[PDB]
């Protein structure tokens, strides 16, 4: 389909698989999102990463 690229997720790090019948992409369905995760951004945002075996403070 040759429509407009006016979706809120146009240019996202996760590609979607949607359905639409109109010339404006935001009219499309939610579809399926990409199953990528990055827990470290929140759970482990340390500069110098420390291993599991070693002692965190040495």
């Amino acid at each position: 389909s040759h429509e407009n690229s006016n979706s809120a997720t146009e240019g996202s790090t996760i590609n979607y698989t949607t359905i639409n019948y109109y010339k404006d992409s935001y009219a499309a369905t939610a579809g399926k999102q990409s199953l990528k995760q990055d827990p470290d951004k929140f759970a482990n945002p340390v500069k110098d990463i420390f291993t599991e075996m070693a002692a965190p403070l040495k």
Binding site: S7, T9, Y26, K36, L57
Partner: protein
């Protein structure tokens, strides 16, 4: 041209934000590997230093003797779209015959979804959100009866003239988008794009919208971010004469194509007002249940 060394070797202007982490595909829960007894010195997975600010890296494998478990449990239902793309109530509009509110056969609703707790608490888990939305409009009398009445919904963006009566000239709707529908027809439904002047809507704005002295009488503007004010939603019965029926319009919103940034603590005190996080100071309650002693269930 550049000649002095400090200028040639400076990092001033680097627009590439270095990232310490990156996303990996994770369509299923991680598996469990076999493990055996370990009796070592130097190695100590169980000991952590929470002060650092990171969460424990200790795993089942290193704390107990585990077996192998091939985990095929999906992670699909916890994506942002899975969590938010479910229509919920965000607005009610009454058009009574004899009343004190909108007895003139029309109503103007400022588009603001923070009037209902269920939906509000979910979106406030994040600071910034960008998304498209599907809006559904359910109309009927206050008993839930369906009557043969024609309505007109019109989206009035900031700066467009707000209708001031049921016969207002603004209903000519030559440019604004309007929907004409019957209460007998199925609920009206349309798709709305991301309309903010900003890259995202934000449920929290720790600032003021204008400059100047922020004296007592203007403190009501603290936290007000125009980037979130998308306009007015106007409704009217279509006719120069009053309607014969009392009506109610329920507005449901279903987000889609969602992106969110900056997670935050979740509301734990009842909401009081749309515009802010004010809470009843004399009723600050614990986040959850309590008990008599720390040594008893």
């Amino acid at each position: 041209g550049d000649r002095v060394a400090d200028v040639i070797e400076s990092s001033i202007g680097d627009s590439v934000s270095r990232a310490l982490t990156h996303a990996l595909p994770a369509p299923t829960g991680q598996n469990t590997q076999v493990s055996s007894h370990r009796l070592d010195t130097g190695k100590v997975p169980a000991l952590q230093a929470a002060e650092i600010g990171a969460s424990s890296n200790a795993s089942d494998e290193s704390m107990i003797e585990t077996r192998c478990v091939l985990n095929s449990h999906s992670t699909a239902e916890t994506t942002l779209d899975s969590f938010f793309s479910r229509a919920g109530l965000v607005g009610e509009i009454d058009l009574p015959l004899e009343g004190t509110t909108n007895p003139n056969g029309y109503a103007n609703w400022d588009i603001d979804i923070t009037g209902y707790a269920q939906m509000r608490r979910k979106v406030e888990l994040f600071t910034y959100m960008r998304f498209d939305a599907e809006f559904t409009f359910v109309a009927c009398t206050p008993t839930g009866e369906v009557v043969p009445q024609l309505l007109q919904y019109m989206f009035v963006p900031p700066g467009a003239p707000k209708p001031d009566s049921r016969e207002s000239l603004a209903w000519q709707t030559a440019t604004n988008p309007s929907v004409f529908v019957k209460l007998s027809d199925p609920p009206a439904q349309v798709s709305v794009p991301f309309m903010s002047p900003a890259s995202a809507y934000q449920w929290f704005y720790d600032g003021y919208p204008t400059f100047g002295e922020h004296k007592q009488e203007k403190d009501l503007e603290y936290g007000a971010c125009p980037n979130n004010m998308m306009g007015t939603f106007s409704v009217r019965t279509v006719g120069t004469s009053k309607s014969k029926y009392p009506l109610v319009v329920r507005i449901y919103m279903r987000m889609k194509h969602v992106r969110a940034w900056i997670p935050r603590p979740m509301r734990n005190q009842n909401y009081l007002f749309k515009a802010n996080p004010n809470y009843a100071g004399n009723s600050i309650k614990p986040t959850g249940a309590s008990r008599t002693a720390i040594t008893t269930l």
